[PDB]
Amino acid sequence: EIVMTQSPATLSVSPGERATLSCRASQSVASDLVWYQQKPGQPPRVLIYEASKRAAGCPDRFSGSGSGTDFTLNINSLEPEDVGVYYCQQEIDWPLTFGGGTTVEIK
């Protein structure tokens, strides 16, 4: 299966500063990569589906880009509400595995 390798598990940044995330891949994923947010005690919801386009209700700070193997997630303004765990999961092969998990804590 297409294994997913993510960023280091902590990138705790003080709010008001731009945070940059990424997650790698084994072989080519093309344009089918999404991102999720799981708050503690809440079910996860999507942010950037098809690796470029925002979802409904998501603010302008959440932006993602990338193609092929390496993909980037860009958070323009960090908020204390935006605490959660970051995941990316491929959608070009069949098993659909998820990311390792990146937890950002509020400073």
């Binding site: 079910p43 996860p44 589906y49 995941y87 098993p95 659909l96 998820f98 990311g99």
Partner: protein, 125 residues
């Protein structure tokens, strides 16, 4: 757009459970449904996946063969009947729905990605 899933409980290994996810609001017959479990260390592990048109089912390599999945479109219910349990399967399970709303410019968000609240499955001896 609310998924009232139930089931779970405390069972010895080797038993069987039936997680029933009840679907309301969204079009159930047109949605591609999967099963994602979450435990400590295993961040959102995939379990199963079923289609919307046709009855083709896809399972993960670790849980292939032991587990079965089914749905009734007239009942809006999704079942993951667990069988031959192992202690590493102790996780909270999310009823996941995925569909692209194909008039894709009238819908500015042509992606559902609505997931259930989550029921906890605890297996131990």
């Amino acid at each position: 757009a609310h998924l009232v899933e139930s089931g779970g409980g405390l069972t010895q290994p080797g038993g069987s459970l039936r997680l029933s996810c009840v679907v309301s609001g969204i079009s159930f017959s047109g949605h591609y449904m999967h099963w994602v479990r979450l435990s400590s260390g295993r961040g959102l592990e995939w379990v199963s996946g079923i289609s919307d048109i046709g009855d083709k089912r896809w399972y993960a390599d670790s849980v292939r063969g032991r587990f079965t999945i089914s749905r009734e479109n007239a009942k809006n219910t999704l079942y993951l009947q667990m069988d031959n349990l192992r202690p590493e399967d102790s996780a909270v399970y999310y009823c996941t729905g995925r569909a692209i709303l194909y008039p894709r410019a009238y819908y500015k968000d042509h992606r559902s990605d609505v997931w259930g609240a989550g029921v906890l499955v605890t297996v131990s001896s």
